Amino acid sequence: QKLIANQFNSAIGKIQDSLSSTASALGKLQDVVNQNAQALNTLVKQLS
Amino acid sequence: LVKNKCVNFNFNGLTGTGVLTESNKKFLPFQQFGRDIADTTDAVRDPQ
Fold first, then answer.
1. Is the Cβ of B39 closer than 8 Å to some Cβ of chain A?
2. What residues have CB less than 8 Å from B42, skipping those under 6 apart?
3. Region (Heptad repeat 1) spans which residues (chain A)?
4. B40 to chain A: which residues are within 8 Å by CB?
5. Chain A (1-48) residues lying within 8 Å, Cβ to Cβ, of chain B
6. Which of A25, A33, A46, B42 sits CB 3.0–4.6 Å from B34 for a disulfide?
């Protein structure tokens, strides 16, 4: 149980290090934000 | 001229409708109008 708890606690440590270092980790959400912002910017630019 | 109130307007034959206000847009001395992403007029220089 001490080993299993320490392995869990350490692996939740690695999640914070990944998310703090690697902004591209969220890339599947940033893709959806970028696609919707690009669709509106295309719609507004088409008024010109 | 009227400011901070919704008005219909015409500058030099450029008609529109909006709240006119003073601005911090640093027009270079040759520039007469400003434009936004749609080519809609964002700002104007007053001819008076």
1. yes
2. B25, B34, B35, B36
3. 1-48
4. 47
5. 41, 44-45, 47-48
6. B42
